[PDB]
Design a protein around this ligand. Structure first.
Ligand SMILES: [Mg+2]
Ligand SMILES: [Mg+2]
Ligand SMILES: [Mg+2]
Ligand SMILES: [Mg+2]
Ligand SMILES: [Mg+2]
Ligand SMILES: [Mg+2]
Ligand SMILES: [Mg+2]
Ligand SMILES: [Mg+2]
Ligand SMILES: [Mg+2]
Ligand SMILES: [Mg+2]
Ligand SMILES: [Mg+2]
Ligand SMILES: [Zn+2]
Lengths: 177, 67, 136, 116, 50
RNA sequence: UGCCUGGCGGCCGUAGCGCGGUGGUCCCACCUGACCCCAUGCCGAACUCAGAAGUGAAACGCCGUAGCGCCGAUGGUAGUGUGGGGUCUCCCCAUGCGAGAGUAGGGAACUGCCAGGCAU
RNA sequence: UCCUCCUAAAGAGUAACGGAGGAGCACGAAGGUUGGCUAAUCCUGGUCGGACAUCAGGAGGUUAGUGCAAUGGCAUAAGCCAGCUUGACUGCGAGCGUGACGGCGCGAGCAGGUGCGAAAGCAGGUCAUAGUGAUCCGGUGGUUCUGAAUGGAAGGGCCAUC
RNA sequence: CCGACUUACCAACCCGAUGCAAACUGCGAAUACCGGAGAAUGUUAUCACGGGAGACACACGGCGGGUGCUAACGUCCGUC
């Protein structure tokens, strides 16, 4: 919670002063971070998915969820019930630890960096993004992983709109344009 | 957290080439020395880019020694 | 040739043509052709009337078809005996009750619309009449 | 949401008890308080009740919302039912699991004398 | 009609048995079930037979 | 006795949606923490436990308001049982029953038991 | 031969070489019970990834789902998931439905012995309706029955089965 | 590096106005049927058991339909 404490001492009041919120809990707070990574090639090789699951358990210290097909789609040759994806949800101290790790170490390590887009808020303030490459996390040992495998990071926030969503992210010195 | 099934998850340390060391808890397994951090980056108010940070750039120009 | 693009079933019972009509008012245009009698309008009958009626007004105004052939009619081939299943669908018809407005017209003078409906009603088996729009 | 899910959980036991025509001991649980009512088979009239929102029970309870609070209210509700003449009831957890205070209340009622 | 009639004989040795069906191409292992024995009036293990 | 709140019903849209406002004494909810009781195909989100710092934001309750949902006559029409007629693929007459849709309107529920808080 | 809908005229039933579709199974879990859970579709944002894979939010509210046709039903789910388990129990059976009959179906409750649940309780197969074949003749196991002078035995009977 | 517009093209979903249905129903009769009570009328007209049958080729007419051509002194059902 080394950034949870950082949140509650300045950021709450910072949004309070500049948005005229009536109560302090009206200042939004990030509730969970969902770590999604859909392999899409388990049909070709089941065995690449367990290795992929191990990769995501290294980057974030949690066992990932193996998602099911949930519906048969012939355009991709999938039948329902087949393992197709990997998922983790992080809340509380583990969530904050992953958040600070991402922003401080990993986000600078992005190749061909230009920062992050500020328009991917789905209209309701919840951020979602995709990293192009996976070696950027120091948890995984370079040269011991089979292939590069990106993933999607979505920040689900209590914020009801993107404007106050941007205030929360910016008060964390999130990389906006 | 389920304990038998879950990986070991303890405290580590990570130092930057600039001499800035960050205290954090992760699962790399052992301490590491990283090269670029959030503070030493041109996008995070990076007036002092990593050019002033040496490396294989120094070996070349100290090899060549031609201004 | 008016005809449903697809149907839930390809054959239907004969049924009965009883009762009065729904849609007895000029709802779209200003003038209308209203059925006085009852009977069946084949798609060929409806389409032949439409050709005469649209050609009468020199392709002016707007023409509305208010009826649709949705009832399929089967006919046994020549010189086949009774039974051996139901016949094959030959054509489609709409059932017509007294008072139903069959065609509507707009954008043309009343004296021209009256003449156009005369030529059109010459193609229909059922007695018709000329009606105009009214405020209810 | 939360309350709607709990009602859907409780409904099957509630309707089954109504069909059996059994006196039903309904337990309610909130983070600060726990409630218990003995309900007549017709379902509209209550017979005895005991809760931690009560002047008599609160002074003894150090902190309402505890298992000891559940034991106190269970003994209290059980003695009131016993002295009125009600001896056989059917438990209605009201969509809660029979693990903590619901189990604690039921366990408290057992020693004092209810049959369920 | 792939499923075939099989006999489940009590392990109590009384000769009573039940009949049922089993698919033998899959699940080729024996079927075992604690079932009631009307002769000894008890529940005993019944084993696959026939 | 009046108001507020919680629980269990009656009842099953006149009762449900939407829009706006309003409540934290108690209550309710959010909420604090979690080796633990207990739990997550992972995750204290839910479930559970230990608590009461903050807050009524959401939710929930209450108040107001017809943009809907809903209820809805009278009259007429359709149909139809019995008997009798015609120009008999369909109608009509005597008599009995009499819709559906629509219209004028109504309408922001009413109510029972217990428990608590405030007031008298 | 059997099941579903319409014809079939608002109880049941109702014909045609009338209009349309299915069955001759499957499952020791896909059954019992306890606990838990709730879709289709669309919009917005998101690595490969696009109309359409996994993810977050929203709308929407069953427009999904049911092992297999159709109708009726299903949220207290009868739909989805997990733990434990064999009640897919044995002898009966008030009463009732449906058939000319053969027969078919439903069933509380009683007895014995069980499973799940803390308990009230639930369980005599599956959301229901197709998945089927009389009698004779034999085969197999058991049996407190019979046994052509008697004691056996063969054969027969009864029960369970092919 | 993510962009911002535009035109007389196509245009799904949605809205408003229209109809149609044996295998459509958010509505819905008249009758018919089942049951309870009451009077009057009816040679028990009702049920059960037993002795004896015949009959199981129907026809037309009305009303409600399928089939046929709302053709047939056609054909197949319901009801009188
Ligand atoms: Mg009227
Ligand atoms: Mg009306
Ligand atoms: Mg009306
Ligand atoms: Mg009928
Ligand atoms: Mg009838
Ligand atoms: Mg099933
Ligand atoms: Mg002898
Ligand atoms: Mg004969
Ligand atoms: Mg005959
Ligand atoms: Mg006849
Ligand atoms: Mg004849
Ligand atoms: Zn640095």
């Amino acid at each position: 919670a080394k950034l949870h404490d950082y949140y509650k001492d300045e950021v709450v009041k910072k949004l309070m002063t500049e948005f005229n919120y009536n109560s302090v809990m009206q200042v939004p707070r990030v509730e969970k971070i969902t770590l999604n990574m859909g392999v899409g090639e388990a049909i070709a090789d089941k065995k690449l998915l367990d290795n992929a699951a191990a990769d995501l358990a290294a980057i974030s210290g949690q066992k990932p969820l193996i998602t099911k097909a949930r519906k048969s789609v012939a355009g991709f040759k999938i039948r329902q019930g087949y393992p197709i994806g990997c998922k983790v949800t992080l809340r509380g101290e583990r969530m904050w630890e992953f958040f600070e790790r991402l922003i401080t170490i990993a986000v600078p390590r992005i190749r061909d960096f230009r920062g992050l887009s500020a328009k991917s808020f789905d209209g309701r303030g919840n951020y979602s993004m995709g990293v192009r490459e996976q070696i950027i996390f120091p948890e995984i040992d370079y040269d011991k992983v089979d292939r590069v495998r990106g993933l999607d990071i979505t920040i689900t926030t209590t914020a009801k709109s993107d404007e106050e969503g941007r205030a929360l992210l910016a008060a964390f010195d999130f990389p906006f344009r | 957290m389920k304990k038998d099934i879950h990986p070991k998850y303890e405290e580590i340390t990570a130092s930057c080439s600039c001499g800035n060391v960050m205290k954090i808890r992760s699962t790399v397994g052992h301490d590491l020395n990283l090269d670029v951090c959030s503070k030493c980056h041109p996008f995070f108010t990076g007036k002092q880019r990593d050019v002033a940070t040496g490396g294989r750039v120094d070996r070349f120009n100290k090899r060549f020694n031609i201004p | 040739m008016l005809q449903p693009k697809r149907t839930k079933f390809r054959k239907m019972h004969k049924g009965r043509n009883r009762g009065l009509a729904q849609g007895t008012d000029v709802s779209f245009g200003s003038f209308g052709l209203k059925a006085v009698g009852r009977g069946r309008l084949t798609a060929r009958q409806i389409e032949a009337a439409r050709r005469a009626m649209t050609r009468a007004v020199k392709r002016q105004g707007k023409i509305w078809i208010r009826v649709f052939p949705d009832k399929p009619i089967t006919e046994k081939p020549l010189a086949v005996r009774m039974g051996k299943g139901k016949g094959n669908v030959e054509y489609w018809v709409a059932l017509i009750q007294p008072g139903k407005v069959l065609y509507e017209m707009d954008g043309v003078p009343e004296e021209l619309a009256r003449e156009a409906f005369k030529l059109a009603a010459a193609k229909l088996p059922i007695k018709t009449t000329f009606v105009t729009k009214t405020v209810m | 949401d939360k309350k709607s899910a709990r009602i859907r959980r409780a409904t099957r036991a509630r309707r089954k008890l109504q069909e059996l025509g059994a006196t039903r001991l309904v337990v309610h649980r909130t983070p600060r308080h726990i409630y218990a009512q003995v309900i007549a088979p017709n379902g509209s009239e209550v017979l005895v009740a005991a809760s931690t929102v009560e002047k008599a029970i609160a002074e003894q309870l150090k902190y309402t919302g505890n298992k000891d609070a559940a034991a106190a209210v269970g003994k209290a509700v059980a003695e009131r039912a016993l002295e009125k003449g009600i001896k056989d009831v059917s438990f209605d957890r009201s969509g809660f699991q029979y693990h903590g205070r619901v189990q604690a209340l039921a366990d408290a009622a057992r020693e004092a004398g209810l049959q369920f | 009609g792939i499923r075939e009639k099989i006999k489940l004989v009590s392990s109590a040795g009384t000769g009573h048995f039940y009949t049922t069906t089993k698919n033998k191409r899959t699940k080729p292992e024996k079927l075992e079930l604690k079932k009631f024995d009307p002769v000894v009036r008890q529940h005993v293990i019944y084993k696959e037979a026939k």
